[PDB]
Design a protein around this ligand. Sequence first.
Ligand code: KY3
Ligand code: ZN
Ligand code: ZN
Length: 565
Amino acid sequence: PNMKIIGNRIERIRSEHAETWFFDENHPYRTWAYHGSYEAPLINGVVRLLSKPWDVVTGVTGIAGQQRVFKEKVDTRVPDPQEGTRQVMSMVSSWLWKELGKHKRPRVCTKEEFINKVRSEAVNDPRFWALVDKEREHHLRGECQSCVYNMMGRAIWYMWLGARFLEFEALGFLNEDHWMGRENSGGGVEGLGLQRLGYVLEEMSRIPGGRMYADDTAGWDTRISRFDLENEALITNQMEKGHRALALAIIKYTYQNKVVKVLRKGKTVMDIISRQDQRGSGQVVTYALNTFTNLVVQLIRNMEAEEVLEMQDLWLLRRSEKVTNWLQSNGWDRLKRMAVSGDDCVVKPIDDRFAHALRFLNDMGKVRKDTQEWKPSTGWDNWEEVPFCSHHFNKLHLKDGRSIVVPCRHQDELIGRARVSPGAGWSIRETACLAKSYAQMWQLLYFHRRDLRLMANAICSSVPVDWVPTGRTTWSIHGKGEWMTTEDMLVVWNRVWIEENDHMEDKTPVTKWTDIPYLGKREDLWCGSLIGHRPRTTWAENIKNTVNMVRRIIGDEEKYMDYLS
Ligand SMILES: CO[C@H]1C[C@H](OC)[C@H](c2cccs2)C[C@@H]1C(=O)O
Ligand SMILES: [Zn+2]
Ligand SMILES: [Zn+2]
């Protein structure tokens, strides 16, 4: 650990718990530096009432310990990549940052920009912004007192709103100005909704070349190296001095010299640990930086596949001109052959040599999940089967014959998520408004699933028509929230799928839900439908009674609409 960079944060924590602070010689940390310890101090009823057949489906109820996740997934170390591999990573990262910045200029994001985003509160308190100003002052002198994570076990690293603001101030431009949008990056998909991603995969399927590859990197955030963090930091070279000072401090304390608080006769202690590599999951620009580095990784894999990089280049890259020529000649074409959303990627290489191009990938520590380290990847011939962003995408037809490309995933995950309510002491109003959000999201994106179109209509029939949807149905950047409204969902469906859909040539509106298709029965069943299963048949036959019961609970004096008739 670099005690000159992390010492101030450790001292501040120690000062706040001086009388319980202690050093535990039997701590379980192996790859994280350990500094000390101190003594530390759900269910959506509306959806559950309307989804009885899923009470006994473990794929649903399972959706609703920290030390265990830490020991197995976060407390690991990987060897450094070889010198040649590191030179290739830096060259490709430098080239990519220059391409992304050709038509965009970095900028500082404002307090008002952050305030407008949070209203979707400590922000309306002048004392919170005073804390923010004090920490900024330390950063401008080369010090950090409070940019510390609280690790909560997949591992999510939390940070106080003030540190997130300082990160947004210095690097939020990557998000706000869409540096990873498809127009700017070629291979990125930032800003596209799930309603558009299938069309991107279908466009890629038509580019001549090999199969479509969609390999996952096992524990992506844990495999981000100190070299990846240095290459991501090259964006500071495009910033003016003042902005650069703010960004260099975020990179130094939040990204590269991290300090984390983790919990461990029924008593609990908090441990203070540190690590220089890995991605601190949950940062304001975690998604943009993951997309950046995954684009760099896939460009390198394509160079190895195309024999631009040879096995002698792992040890030392003697001559760099071949890599520069490949990036200038082919880089943009290869970026357009990718769809990269953070750690998720689909690549359409120029041939199938990509399947066995694993030397640089493995030397970089970007090991594929569920495949033997040196077994060639298996590509897909059918774009409709390619996994991307936890979905697959299928082409269906409206009653009038027009095709549409819709997102799909196994239905248990969707119902399981809708049955979860984050927050205790929640009234039936907050609960019903979050249920309405899920149901309207299903009407917009998963209308082609028989069980979800019915369940959504039952939920919408059970919640007062004037109640505004609230809460978050997903954390995915591809969930644009068009369903968070009291506007008629058939009107919103038309806006999303017809009017604003550049892949729908004929703009004729759709005037009835019966013109909007379902998947074929076989596909609906493959993806988890309970159509034809007796408990589901009973639930559908009894659905009007179940809706009347929910309306009685919420209040028969409210105004309801029958979306089931
Ligand atoms: C990785 O998983 C998420 C991805 C996905 O978008 C790509 C989903 C969306 C739903 C609605 C709009 S986007 C949400 C989903 C989730 O919450 O698990
Ligand atoms: Zn700080
Ligand atoms: Zn499906």
